[PDB]
Amino acid sequence: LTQGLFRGLSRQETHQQLADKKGLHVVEIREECGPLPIVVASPRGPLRKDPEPEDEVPDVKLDWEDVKTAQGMKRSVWSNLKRAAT
C-alpha cells in the first residue's frame, strides 16, 4: 500500500504537462462558478487550432463501484459514516 501510493502519486500528470502535450488550453468548469471558463494551464509553445475530435461514445473502462454508487444501487451501512476530522 505504501509503495503503491507513492508510485501512483509520482506518475500523476499535472494540468500544465497535459496542456503542453496536447498543445491546448485546459479549461476548468466549476458548478459553484457557473459557466465561467477558467484557464488553469496554457501551453508554452505553439497552440493547436484544430479542436479535439468529440467522440460520441468514449471507449473508457468504468469501475462498477463508481457506476453503482452513482445509480444509487449500492446500499452500505458502513458508507458515509460520520467520523472525526482528519
Added chain:
Amino acid sequence: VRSSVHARWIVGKVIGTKMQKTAKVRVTRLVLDPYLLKYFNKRKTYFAHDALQQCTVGDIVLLRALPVPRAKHVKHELAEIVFKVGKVIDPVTGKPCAGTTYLESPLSSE
C-alpha cells in the same frame, strides 16, 4: 377498433403449423435487466389465426389483435407475412434476394 387483446400489433417468428387454421408464433421483446442494464430477448408464444394456412415454419409474420379472442389461446390473426422463409423480397428494391445477394439485379428494371 376497440379490442380486448393487450397485444395489438406484434411481429414474431412462426415455430409451428401443426394446428388447423392456427400458426404458433414466437414473439421476442427486449427486456431490461435491472442489475446488468443490458437488454436480453424474452420469448412469449402467441397463437395466430391463419385462414389460408399459408404460414410456413420459420418465417416472420405480422399479427393483428382480434376484437375478441376466438379461442382460449388464439387472440391474434395473421395480418401479413413480412419475410417468407427462403423467399424474402427486399422492401427497398422489390427484387428477390437470398441473404445479402440479389437473386434479380435491381438494374433489370432500371
Added chain:
Amino acid sequence: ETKKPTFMDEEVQSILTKMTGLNLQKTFKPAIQELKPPTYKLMTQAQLEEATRQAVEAAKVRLKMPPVLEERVPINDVLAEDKILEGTETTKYVFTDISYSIPHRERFIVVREPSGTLRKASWEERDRMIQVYFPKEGRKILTPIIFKEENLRTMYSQDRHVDVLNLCFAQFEPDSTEYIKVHHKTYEDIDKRGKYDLLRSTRYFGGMVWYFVNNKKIDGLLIDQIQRDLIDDATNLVQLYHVLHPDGQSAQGAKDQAAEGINLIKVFAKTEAQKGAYIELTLQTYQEALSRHSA
C-alpha cells in the same frame, strides 16, 4: 402629448445596462456552498472564446434588471356583511383558493371576520397565505428580524448591500411597502457613504440609478463615475436625467448651449447639481489627467 419614459423602456434599458457592465468574475463569483469535483476540457483558442461568449450570454440573464413598481394600493373590499353571525365565533376564518392553475395575483383570499363581515384579505395577509400553501425558497412566512433597522445597519457596516437586496427580493413582493422601504433605505446608505461600486455588475444597479434620478440626487453617483474613468456612463447619467426632467434648468441649459459629451456635466453641475463646485473640481482633475495620456 409627451410621456416621460418608464423604467422598462428600451432606451432606459439600454442606458442602464451599459451603466451596469458584465463582470464575468463578479457575476459568477465562487459561491460558498456544497462543492463537487470540477471537470476539465481541452479547448482551443476559438473554443475558449466561444465558452467566454456563452458566459457573457448567461451573465445577461443573471443581470436582468427587476421591474420597478409603485406601492400597491391596500385592499379594503367587503363582499358581504352577514350580521346574523355576529358574536358567534371569536376567531376570524381565512379562506385561500389553492387551485394550482391560477396566478398568485388572481387568487380569491377572503376573511370571515368575527363580526360576520366577509372581506377580501389584505396584501400582507395574501402574501403570508400564499407562502403557506405554495412555499417559495428563501421566503419566510414571518418577517425575519434581518429587516429591522439595527440588523440592516449591521449589514451596511459590513458592505453587504447586495445581500440585503437579495434577501428583500426573495421575501417581499416588488410592490409591497416593506420592499420599497428596504430598497430605498439601502440606496440612501449607498449614496451617503459612496458605495455605488458594490452594486456595479449586478441586476440591482438599474434600480439604484432610477431612484437617484427621480430624486435629483445623482450628484454622488456622477462624482464616483468620473473618478473611476466612466465618462461614457457619466454622460448617459446626465442625459437620462435630462430625458426624465425636460422642464429643468439643466435640461433647458443643454438645449440652449447644444452641449454634448463632457459639456453636459458642466451644464448640469452649474445649473442643478447641489455640489457643483465639487463636480467641477472632480471633472477638471480628470480632464487634466486625460490630456497627459493623450500626449
Added chain:
Amino acid sequence: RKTRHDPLAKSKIERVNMPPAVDPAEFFVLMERYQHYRQTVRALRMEFVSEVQRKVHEARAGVLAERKALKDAAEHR
C-alpha cells in the same frame, strides 16, 4: 361496531327514546330555511354538473381539441 348477528343488549331491551319537544315558532322557520337552502344548493349543483360535462365534451370533440387532431394528422402525412 356490532354486526347483524350480535344479540341485543339486555339493558337496552326496555329502552325507549322519547322524541324531543318541538318549539312551534322555531320549527316552522327552520323548516322553511331547509327548503330554501336545498333549493339554492341543488341549483348550484346542476351548474357544477354542467361544467364537468362541458369540460369532458370540450376535451373530446371541442373546436380546439378537433383542430389539434386534424393538425397532427396533417403533419403525419
Added chain:
Amino acid sequence: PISPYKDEPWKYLESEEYQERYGSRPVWADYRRNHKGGVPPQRTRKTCIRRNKVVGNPCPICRDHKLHVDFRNVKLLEQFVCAHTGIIFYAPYTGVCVKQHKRLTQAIQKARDHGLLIYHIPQVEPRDLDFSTSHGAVSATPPAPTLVSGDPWYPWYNWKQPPERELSRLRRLYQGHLQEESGPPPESMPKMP
C-alpha cells in the same frame, strides 16, 4: 469557576491566554474521542457536564469554561462552520457533545439572522410572472344590491314570524311535546355589563 468574559464573549478570543493555548488553529483540532473500534459512534455524548460535574474527557466547548457559545461571538462560531461550503460540522466531526452542538447550531442560526455571520444568500427569480393588480380578486368587486341596501344576502336569513294558523297546526301535530314559543331573536348579540 466564574469566567470574566461572560458579558463580552469575543474578548476571550483576543486575549493572550487564548493565543498561548489554542493558537491559529480551531479549538477542536487537538481533541480526540475515546471509543472502541475504528469506527466512532455516530452520536457524541449527550452532555459533558452533569449536575455541575465535568466528565473525564470534556468536549472542546466544555473543556474550556471561558469559551461562551453566544451569537455575538462570531469568531468562535466560524471555527464550527466549513469555510469552503458554509455548512455546520456534525457532532462527530469536531467532537463537541450533543447539548453544545445544539447550542452552537442555535447560536450560528441566530448570528446569521442578525447579519453578524457571513453566509451565502442565493439569488432567486420573481414569484409572479405578471405584476398586474387589475384582477377582481385583488381589485374592488362592485357591491351587490343586497349589500348596498343593508338587506340580508337572502330573504330567509332574517327571522320571519310564521302565520298563526301554521303555529296552531304544529301545536296540534305535536300535542304534549311542545316548548314555549319563541319570538324574533334580538337584532344584535347582547353583552354582559
Added chain:
Amino acid sequence: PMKGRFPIRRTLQYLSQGNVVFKDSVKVMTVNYNTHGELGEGARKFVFFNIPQIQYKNPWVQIMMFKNMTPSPFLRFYLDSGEQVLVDVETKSNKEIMEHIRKILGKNEETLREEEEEKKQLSHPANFGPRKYCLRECICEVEGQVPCPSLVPLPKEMRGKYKAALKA
C-alpha cells in the same frame, strides 16, 4: 471494471440520453442490418449504441432485429393504424439514423414539455400527507401555527386533561 466493450452502454445515465420518444401510433420496430459491408456501418453502430436508448424511452414498443436477410440495411415501423413505415439507413451514420426516425415518428420537444407539466399538477404543494407524496405532513410544520405537542407541549387550558378537571 465493468465487463464488455464500451461499458458506458449499460448505465442509466447513457440510456436516459435517448432523444427519440415514439408517438402513440408506433407499435413495432424491426431492424434489418448487415453484419458486414462498409455501407451498413451506420446500421451496426445504430444497433450497438442507439437501440438500447430507443427501447429504454419506449418500453412498450417491440423491437426485433434481423441480421443478414436483405442485401441492404433498413428500418421498418408498424403504426397502430396499420400503416407500415419504411426507412432506408444505408450509408448513413447512427446519428443521422437517430435524427431521421425522431423527425418522422418522434414526439417534438413541445409535446414532451407539455407531458412533464401534467405530472407537476399531480403533486400539489398545498396538500398534506406522508413525505412520499407531500412536502409536509401536518400543519404544525407551518411556522406561526400551533406546533406539534410532541415538540412543544400545549398549555393546560388547551389540553383536555385539565379541561375536565377545571369544569369538574
Added chain:
Amino acid sequence: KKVRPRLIAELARRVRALREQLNRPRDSQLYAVDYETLTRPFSGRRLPVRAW
C-alpha cells in the same frame, strides 16, 4: 389461471334465494301489531313513540 371452484357457495346461494321465496313472510305476519304493548310480534321491535 385455474382456481378451485366453490360449488357449495353457488349451491347455498340458490337454496337461500329459493327458500326466501317459498317461505316468504306475508303482510298479515310482517305488519301485525299488538295494540297493548305496541310491538310487532314478528320482530319484537317497538314502534316509534310518535306513532303510538
Added chain:
Amino acid sequence: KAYRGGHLTIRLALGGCTNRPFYRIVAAHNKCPRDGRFVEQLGSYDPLPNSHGEKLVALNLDRIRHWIGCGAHLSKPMEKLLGLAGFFPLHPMMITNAERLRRKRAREVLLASQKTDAE
C-alpha cells in the same frame, strides 16, 4: 375495496396529535374510514388559531366544483365551511344557532340586571 353501493363524500379527515386537531378536506368514499383511503384531498382546515389569531382554511375550488359536479356529497361540517367562505349560502343550522345564542345571552342580561338592582 369495492363497497356495496356508497358514494363519494367531501369530508374532514382528522390529523395532528392529541389535543392538536387538524382536518384535511378530502374527497373519499362514504364507507371508507375517516382517515383511510381517499380519492383526492381538496384542501385543509386548521381549527386552532395561529400566532395571528386566524383559522387557516384551504379550498381547492376548481377541484371542489369538479367533484360536486360528479355526484360527491358534502358532510354537514363541510357545508358550514363553504357557507363561512361564502362559496355556499349560510347553512340554516348556523343561522339557527346564532338566533339561539342571542336568546341565551338576552336572558342572561335580565338575570344580571335583577341581581344588581334588587341587591
Added chain:
Amino acid sequence: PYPPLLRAMIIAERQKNGDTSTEEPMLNVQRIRMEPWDYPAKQEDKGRAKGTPV
C-alpha cells in the same frame, strides 16, 4: 343571488375576459321542483322485510 364568493369570482371572470356589464349573476332555481317531505315515494323501488321470525 349567488353566494358572496361565487358571485365575486364570476364577475371577476368577466372583467378578466374584457366583458363589461353591471348585470348581477343569478341562479335559475325555477327548474328546481322542491317537493313536500311527505310526498309519496316510489313503492316499487322500496324493499321488503326479511323472512326471519321471532
